[PDB]
Amino acid sequence: QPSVFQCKKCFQIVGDSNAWVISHREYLSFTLSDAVENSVRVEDTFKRSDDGLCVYSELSCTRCNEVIGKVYNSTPIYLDDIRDMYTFSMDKLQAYQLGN
Amino acid sequence: QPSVFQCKKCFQIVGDSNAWVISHREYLSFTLSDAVENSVRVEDTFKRSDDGLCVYSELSCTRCNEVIGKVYNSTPIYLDDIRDMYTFSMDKLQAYQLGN
Ligand SMILES: [Zn+2]
Ligand SMILES: [Zn+2]
């Protein structure tokens, strides 16, 4: 049964499992191939990762302007699958699993 | 593909399809056999239907106190399928269909 993902603050649906790619328990994050277009804004600034191998732009929630994850623009070879995809911080989102 | 239903005001998920019973095109409403536990509050007043064949109590969104529908407590025999069941007003809700 699929889950839907929401901003924790305002409760805007950012996207669902189904468009899921991969999770990183190390990073405390998960990555979707797709997101709700109006719910999410990728910011117009490139920031250094902490490591700092990667380059990303923040994605903010459209409703409450929380920084809820990252779009990774440049990556090493091993982090290619999260590149140009929607990476959400677990800390910032909640999941609703459907019934039945 | 399933949908998920939220209050229009606060974005609280009140329930998903799958727990759906029936829809009425005439009155802008639909009916679910289930709702999210603390999502919804059924009020302490018995009100007459518009006809008024039925008796209902209002259901309110827990977070924002919007009247988003009705729990029909008493019905004629043909409207038994919606009795003791969660009837949401379409006007007060919004749907999110899952992708893929
Ligand atoms: Zn938000
Ligand atoms: Zn609400």
Residue numbers in the entry:
A (entry chain A), B (entry chain B): 19 to 118
Publication passage describing the model:
To structurally characterize spMis181–120, we purified recombinant spMis181–120 as a mono‐disperse sample and obtained crystals that diffracted X‐rays to about 2.6 Å. The structure was determined by single anomalous dispersion (SAD) exploiting the Zn anomalous signal from the bound Zn2+ ions in the crystals. The overall fold of spMis181–120 is formed by antiparallel β‐sheets: a three‐stranded (β1‐β2‐β9: β‐sheet I) and a six‐stranded (β3‐β4‐β8‐β7‐β6‐β5: β‐sheet II) sheet, arranged approximately perpendicular to each other. The two β‐sheets are held together by a Zn2+ ion coordinated via the C‐X‐X‐C motifs from loops L1 and L5. Although these proteins recognize substrates as diverse as nucleic acids to proteins, they do so via a common cradle‐shaped binding pocket formed by β‐sheet II. While the interface stabilizing dimer I is formed by the stacking of loops L5 and L7 of one monomer over their dimeric counterpart, the dimer II interface is formed by the stacking of β‐sheet I. In contrast, dimer II is stabilized by highly conserved residues (V22, I31, Y114, and L116) and has an extensive binding interface (as compared to dimer I) with a 1,431 Å2 buried surface area. Consistent with this, the other dimer II interface mutants Y114A, Y114E, and V22E also behaved as smaller entities compared to the wild‐type protein when analyzed by native PAGE, thus demonstrating that the dimerization of spMis181–120 is mediated via the dimer II interface.
Here, by combining structural, biochemical, and yeast genetic studies, we show that the oligomerization of S. pombe Mis18, mediated via its conserved N‐terminal Yippee‐like domain, is crucial for its centromere localization and function. Here, we show that fission yeast Mis18 and its human isoforms, Mis18α and Mis18β, possess two structurally distinct domains: an N‐terminal “Yippee‐like” globular domain and a C‐terminal α‐helical domain.
